[PDB]
Design a protein around this ligand. Sequence first.
Ligand SMILES: C=CC[C@@H]1/C=C(\C)C[C@H](C)C[C@H](OC)[C@H]2O[C@@](O)(C(=O)C(=O)N3CCCC[C@H]3C(=O)O[C@H](/C(C)=C/[C@@H]3CC[C@@H](O)[C@H](OC)C3)[C@H](C)[C@@H](O)CC1=O)[C@H](C)C[C@@H]2OC
Length: 191
Amino acid sequence: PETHINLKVSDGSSEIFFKIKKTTPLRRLMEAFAKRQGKEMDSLRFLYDGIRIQADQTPEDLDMEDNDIIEAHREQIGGSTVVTTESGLKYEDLTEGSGAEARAGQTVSVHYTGWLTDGQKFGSSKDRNPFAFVLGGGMVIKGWDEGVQGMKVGGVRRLTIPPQLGYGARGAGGVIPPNATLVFEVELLDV
Ligand SMILES: C=CC[C@@H]1/C=C(\C)C[C@H](C)C[C@H](OC)[C@H]2O[C@@](O)(C(=O)C(=O)N3CCCC[C@H]3C(=O)O[C@H](/C(C)=C/[C@@H]3CC[C@@H](O)[C@H](OC)C3)[C@H](C)[C@@H](O)CC1=O)[C@H](C)C[C@@H]2OC
C-alpha cells in the first residue's frame, strides 16, 4: 500500500488497471498498456488531469493517488470529434481511412471488437482470424448498417449504439442484456 499505486487506464472503450511502485517511471505502465493492446508506443498519447504524461515521470512526480485515471488516446492527432446522427447513433473516427469508401450494397470486410458500456468485451472477430457482411442489407444491427457507411479502408471507427439500434429489450441470448448500449471498434479492411 505505501510503496505501490494502482492506476486505472481508460481508452474510451475499456478500462484496465496497473499496479506500479510510486517511484517507477510511467514508461513501464505505458509499455505494458501498449503491448497488451498490440500497439506501438509511438502511436499512443497518455493524459492525467488534462496534462500530457511523459515516459520518464513517476506517479510520485505527478502526485497521483490510488485509482486515479490516466487517459490513453489512440485517435488521430488534431482533436477528436464524436458525431451524433439523426438516429441517435454516435460515432468517432479513431483513424481516418485512406482507401475505398464503404457504401450500401457492398460486401464489406472488417475486424471488430464490441464492449458493453462498463468495458466488458462481448465479442470480437480478432480473437481468432475477418467478418464480412452486406452493408445496408438489414442483416446486421441498425447501428452497423448506418455506422459503417462512409468509412474508408484503413479506418477505425468507434460506434456507440443505443439499444433501439442494437438488440433492444430482447438482448441476444447468452451475450447482450436487455436495453444495452453497445460500443464497437470497427476496422475496415476491404469493400
Ligand atoms: C445464421 C445465423 C447466425 C449468424 C452468425 C454469424 C454470421 C456469426 C457472426 C460473427 C455473429 C457472432 O456469432 C459468433 C455473434 O456476434 C455478436 O456477439 C456480436 O458481436 C454482434 O453484435 N455482431 C456481430 C458483428 C456485426 C454486428 C453484430 C451483428 O449485427 O450480428 C448479426 C446479428 C446477430 C443480427 C441480429 C439478427 C436477428 C435480428 O432480429 C436482430 O435484430 C435485433 C439482429 C449477425 C452477424 C447476423 O447477421 C448473422 C448471424 O446471426 C452477437 C451479439 C451475437 C452473434 O451470434 C449470433
